[PDB]
Structures are given as C-alpha cells and as structure tokens.
Amino acid sequence: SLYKELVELYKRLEKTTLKTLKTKFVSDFLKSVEKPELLEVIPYLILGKVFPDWDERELGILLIKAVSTIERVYNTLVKIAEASGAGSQDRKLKYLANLFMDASPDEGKYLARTVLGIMRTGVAEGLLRDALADAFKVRVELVERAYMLTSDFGFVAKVAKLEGDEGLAKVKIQVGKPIKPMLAQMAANVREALVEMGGEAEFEIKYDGARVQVHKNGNKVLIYSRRLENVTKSIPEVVERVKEALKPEKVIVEGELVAVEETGRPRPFQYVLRRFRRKYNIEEMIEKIPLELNLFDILYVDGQNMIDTPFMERRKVLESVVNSNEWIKSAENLITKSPEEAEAFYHKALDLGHEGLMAKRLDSTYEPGNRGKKWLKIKPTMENLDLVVLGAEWGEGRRSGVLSSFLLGAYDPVKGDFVPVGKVGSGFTDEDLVEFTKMLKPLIKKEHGKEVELEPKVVIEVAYQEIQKSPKYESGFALRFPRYIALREDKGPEDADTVQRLAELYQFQERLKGGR
Numbered sequence: 001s002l003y004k005e006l007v008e009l010y011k012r013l014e015k016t017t018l019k020t021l022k023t024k025f026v027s028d029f030l031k032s033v034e035k036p037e038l039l040e041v042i043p044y045l046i047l048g049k050v051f052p053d054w055d056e057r058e059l060g061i062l063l064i065k066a067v068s069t070i071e072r073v074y075n076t077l078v079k080i081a082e083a084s085g086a087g088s089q090d091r092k093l094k095y096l097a098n099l100f101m102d103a104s105p106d107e108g109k110y111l112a113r114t115v116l117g118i119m120r121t122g123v124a125e126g127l128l129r130d131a132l133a134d135a136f137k138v139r140v141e142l143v144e145r146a147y148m149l150t151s152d153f154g155f156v157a158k159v160a161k162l163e164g165d166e167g168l169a170k171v172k173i174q175v176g177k178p179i180k181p182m183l184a185q186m187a188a189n190v191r192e193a194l195v196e197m198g199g200e201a202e203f204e205i206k207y208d209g210a211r212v213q214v215h216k217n218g219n220k221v222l223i224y225s226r227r228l229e230n231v232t233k234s235i236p237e238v239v240e241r242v243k244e245a246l247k248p249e250k251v252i253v254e255g256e257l258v259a260v261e262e263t264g265r266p267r268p269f270q271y272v273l274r275r276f277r278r279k280y281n282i283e284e285m286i287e288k289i290p291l292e293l294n295l296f297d298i299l300y301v302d303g304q305n306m307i308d309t310p311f312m313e314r315r316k317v318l319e320s321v322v323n324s325n326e327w328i329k330s331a332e333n334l335i336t337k338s339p340e341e342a343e344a345f346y347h348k349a350l351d352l353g354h355e356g357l358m359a360k361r362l363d364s365t366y367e368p369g370n371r372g373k374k375w376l377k378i379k380p381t382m383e384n385l386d387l388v389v390l391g392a393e394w395g396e397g398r399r400s401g402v403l404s405s406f407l408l409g410a411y412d413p414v415k416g417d418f419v420p421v422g423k424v425g426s427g428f429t430d431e432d433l434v435e436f437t438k439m440l441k442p443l444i445k446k447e448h449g450k451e452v453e454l455e456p457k458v459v460i461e462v463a464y465q466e467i468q469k470s471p472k473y474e475s476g477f478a479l480r481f482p483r484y485i486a487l488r489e490d491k492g493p494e495d496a497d498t499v500q501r502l503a504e505l506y507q508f509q510e511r512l513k514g515g516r
C-alpha cells in the first residue's frame with residue numbers, strides 16, 4: 001500500500017458531503033490494507049493528523065521556504081520529529097526532499113496539508129469508528145470501547161482487523177495511553193440527586209479547573225489535558241509533586257487542576273490553561289500561577305484495571321494510594337444518605353468559590369467517554385456550552401480587518417460536518433477580536449463576501465439566556481443571546497458539545513420551569 005491509494009481516498013471523500021458515502025469510502029480503504037502498512041499508520045492520515053493528540057512527538061514547519069509509499073512517509077515523519085538533537089533546527093528540507101523527488105504535484109498538496117495540519121478532510125472520529133467496524137466487520141460497540149480505553153486509533157484498528165470481537169473486548173488499559181473521561185449529566189438540586197442515586201450518594205466539590213489525567217510509571221509521569229494534549233513539559237512542578245505523593249509505581253489517576261490564589265482559593269480555569277500554553281518561561285509562570293490538583297478517581301493501580309470497580313471502592317483505594325500534601329489532595333467528599341449536610345456541603349463549596357457539587361453513584365463502575373446519570377453536576381447556574389466556531393463574519397470599515405461575529409456549530413451523529421447551532425457577537429473585547437481574527441484567519445474553508453465558513457478546529461465556551469427550538473438553524477436549535485465566556489483550548493473538535501447535548505440541557509431547562 002502506497003500514498004496514491006490514500007490520495008484516491010482523499011479525492012473520493014473530497015467530492016461528497018454525505019455521511020455513509022464517506023463511511024463507505026474510508027471503510028473501503030481500510031479494507032484495502034494488509035498490515036506492514038499496519039494502520040498504526042493510516043487512520044491518523046485519514047483524519048489528516050500525523051500522530052495521536054497525546055503523542056508528545058511534534059514536527060511542523062518556513063513551509064513557504066521548504067517549498068522550493070505510505071510507510072515511507074510515516075517513516076519520514078518519525079525520522080524528522082523524533083530526531084532529538086542539535087544538528088537540525090530548520091533543516092528538514094533534505095528530510096522533506098528524501099521522499100519528494102518522486103512525489104507527484106497531485107500528492108504534494110496533501111503532504112503539506114498533513115504537515116501544517118492544513119488537511120481539511122471531513123472525517124470525524126465517530127465516522128472512522130463506523131468505518132473500522134464496517135471494514136473489518138466488528139461490533140462498533142467494541143471499536144467504541146477499545147478506543148475509549150486507549151485513544152489509539154491504530155491500535156484499535158490492528159486489533160480489529162486481526163483479533164476481532166474477541167480481542168477488542170479483551171483490550172485493556174495501558175499507561176501512557178489516555179482513557180476517555182467518564183462524564184456527568186446535570187441535576188436540579190441536591191435532594192434530587194439523592195433521589196436518582198436511590199437514597200444515598202457520594203458528593204464532591206466540583207472544582208473550577210482543567211480535568212487532567214495522570215499516568216505514573218516508575219520515575220516517568222505523563223499528564224494529559226481534557227483535549228488529550230500532553231501537558232507534562234509545561235507543568236514540571238506538578239510533575240515532581242505528583243511523583244512523591246503517589247504511592248504506587250504503576251498508577252493512572254484523574255483529577256482537576258485548579259490555579260489557586262495563595263489564599264488557597266481557585267482562580268478561573270482560564271489561568272490553568274495559560275499554564276498549559278507555556279507562553280512565558282516556566283520559571284516566571286510557576287510563581288505567577290500556582291496550581292493545586294484534586295484527584296477524584298483511580299483508573300489503574302499496580303497492573304489492576306479499576307473501570308469495573310464501583311465508585312465506593314475506587315475512592316477508598318484512591319485515598320489509600322495518595323498521601324496528600326497541600327499541593328496534591330484527594331478531592332473533598334461526603335457520603336451521606338440525607339440532603340441536609342449535603343446542601344451544607346453544597347453551600348460550603350459555593351462560598352469556597354468554585355462551581356458546585358458532583359454527585360457520584362456509589363455502585364457506579366467507570367464508563368469512559370460516557371455522560372450519564374452515574375455522575376451528576378449541581379450548579380447555581382445553567383451549564384454553559386463549549387462549541388466549535390463553525391464560521392464567522394467580518395466587520396465593516398476600519399473593522400474590515402476584524403472578524404466580529406462567530407458562527408457556532410455543534411456535532412450531529414447523523415451528519416458529521418457540524419451543524420450550526422447559532423452565532424455570537426456579544427461578550428468579546430477588542431483584543432479578544434484581534435485574537436480570534438488572526439487565529440481563525442488560516443481556518444477559513446469558504447469566503448462569501450464579508451461572511452466566512454471556518455474549518456472547525458476552535459472550541460469556545462459561551463453562555464446563553466435560553467435554549468429554544470429554532471429551525472432557523474439546521475439543528476432546529478438556537479441560543480437566546482449567546483455571549484463569549486472563554487475559548488477552551490483544553491477542548492478540541494471531538495470534545496465539543498453535541499446536538500443531543502443541547503437537547504438534554506433544554507430538557508433540564510423546562511424541568512427548571514416545571515420544577516421551580
């Protein structure tokens with residue numbers, strides 16, 4: 001298998017907007033591969049990615065300057081990036097020349113697109129899940145599960161094509177390979193949560209921060225953000241910290257990383273994300289923004305997989321496994337059968353100033369990548385939305401050098417390409433708009449007058465007065481007065497709220513009419 005076949009797939013997919021046609025084309029291409037080509041390989045090329053989001057390997061490039069088989073090209077990619085040492089900085093022109101001499105002007109567009117991540121190919125991860133489970137005739141539930149436990153497409157692809165149902169089912173946790181976050185639905189009040197949970201429950205402060213995941217093996221700690229970027233290199237001090245306070249040698253834990261004031265109180269999560277960016281030099285930053293990490297779960301310890309263990313037990317273990325500093329702590333909990341002290345905790349947590357409560361079903365096992373009623377948020381406010389900036393619209397006059405308005409998409413399982421759920425102009429300052437304009441400019445996949453269709457890689461969090469059903473957008477959904485809250489860089493396109501999400505928040509809302 002070579003790059004011409006994959007190019008032919010890129011073209012086949014170029015022509016259509018239509019879901020199962022794309023599914024069928026990809027799936028066909030995957031069916032077309034025997035695996036020295038292994039498909040460690042391909043799936044990320046199909047996605048247009050190079051390496052998994054969690055890889056810690058980065059090579060990108062002065063692409064206008066460098067401008068004068070498949071296994072060959074993955075090889076090229078590992079051998080450019082990994083390649084850790086001093087003799088090459090720019091370089092890579094000869095590295096990129098090594099393959100390029102026999103490469104067609106046909107393919108070059110896709111090579112460079114892959115390079116700068118300038119590939120716009122419309123394949124969603126769910127569409128690829130469908131594509132794998134088709135091509136290799138496996139239950140998609142399984143490609144689902146194994147993806148949720150690993151977040152390695154290549155891995156689930158090989159296991160699928162070789163071992164099938166079988167092996168996929170048997171697939172388990174691997175350190176340094178991120179497990180997808182189990183997620184919460186919403187609750188009205190405490191007493192309610194207490195009802196759904198069947199009379200008793202865990203309660204936790206819901207902290208305002210970045211959900212992170214920590215993988216400890218020996219003296220090597222890996223820490224991941226919600227968008228599964230490897231944030232280790234950026235937060236060295238929470239590296240050293242998490243080494244010492246974690247008792248086991250092979251662990252995987254989950255927690256909330258909160259920027260705090262020295263008061264011991266949380267700053268807005270926007271700062272913690274500043275810390276991930278590593279804009280300045282970490283010497284300065286580590287003092288300018290201190291961070292505490294409050295662990296709420298244990299996915300793995302000591303060659304043991306905790307997924308299938310109830311909450312109650314996982315919690316006891318978690319407490320057992322960590323001996324806490326002021327810099328690392330097991331997230332504050334209360335297990336009670338009565339709502340009084342519950343809402344006492346709710347208030348204590350509010351006046352502590354983060355978000356709300358979490359309410360954990362005690363007997364709940366862990367379901368990676370699943371919002372459910374096993375976990376439940378309790379907040380003063382209505383949940384905000386993280387959605388992709390789908391399109392935008394410029395300003396006029398002096399503001400013609402500015403994108404003022406932002407077309408916002410959500411994701412639809414029977415579509416793919418991201419249905420629009422609204423447009424948002426309120427909440428931004430000037431520098432906010434210079435930012436968004438400069439940053440979004442590269443991502444424009446269509447230009448109509450002063451309005452623009454964006455290649456949807458950017459997730460912002462916006463609040464809204466009301467959710468209503470409007471088929472003035474495809475979704476039959478719209479937002480009453482959206483406003484910028486922040487851009488969540490710790491979420492990418494596959495992390496953004498779906499349409500069914502909107503549905504559920506709506507349902508909660510009419511229940512907060514009815515229940516009020």
Ligand SMILES: Nc1ncnc2c1ncn2[C@@H]1O[C@H](COP(=O)(O)O)[C@@H](O)[C@H]1O
Binds near residue numbers: 182206208210211331
């Ligand atoms: N102690 C906690 N336990 C669980 N989730 C938390 C906690 N503190 C903050 N959170 C947030 O709650 C979210 C629950 O999932 P969701 O709101 O669907 O993203 C997490 O992703 C975190 O951002």
